[PDB]
Design a protein around this nucleic acid. Structure first.
Length: 72
DNA sequence: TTGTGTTTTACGACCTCC
DNA sequence: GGAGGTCGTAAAACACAA
């Protein structure tokens, strides 16, 4: 959810907050999630998923770094 | 423009956890 | 008694050289 829009761009504000809390801890907790969702106007499920996407982004960034250590 | 390669939301299938 | 982890991918959104 939702899905009358295939997917929705989160605001610069919303992404800033999520990137900051991600630096604080890579796995959000049930309470933190509940709080962030409410302060940011997104659902628990959207935070949940965002966190899942961001750790995949990190894994993808990390493999690239590793490939660059390997070539250098 | 465009067209093509990358990044950002959302999900399904499947797995792990006493 | 279910939450939340990954992997892989669709589609929309964006970046950018040609």
């Amino acid at each position: 959810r939702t899905k009358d829009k295939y997917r929705v761009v989160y605001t610069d504000h919303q992404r800033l907050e999520l990137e900051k809390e991600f630096h604080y801890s890579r796995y959000i907790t049930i309470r933190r999630k509940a709080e962030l969702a409410a302060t940011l106007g997104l659902s628990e499920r959207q935070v949940k998923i965002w966190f899942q996407n961001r750790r995949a982004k990190e894994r993808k960034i990390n493999k690239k770094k590793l490939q660059q250590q390997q070539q250098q």
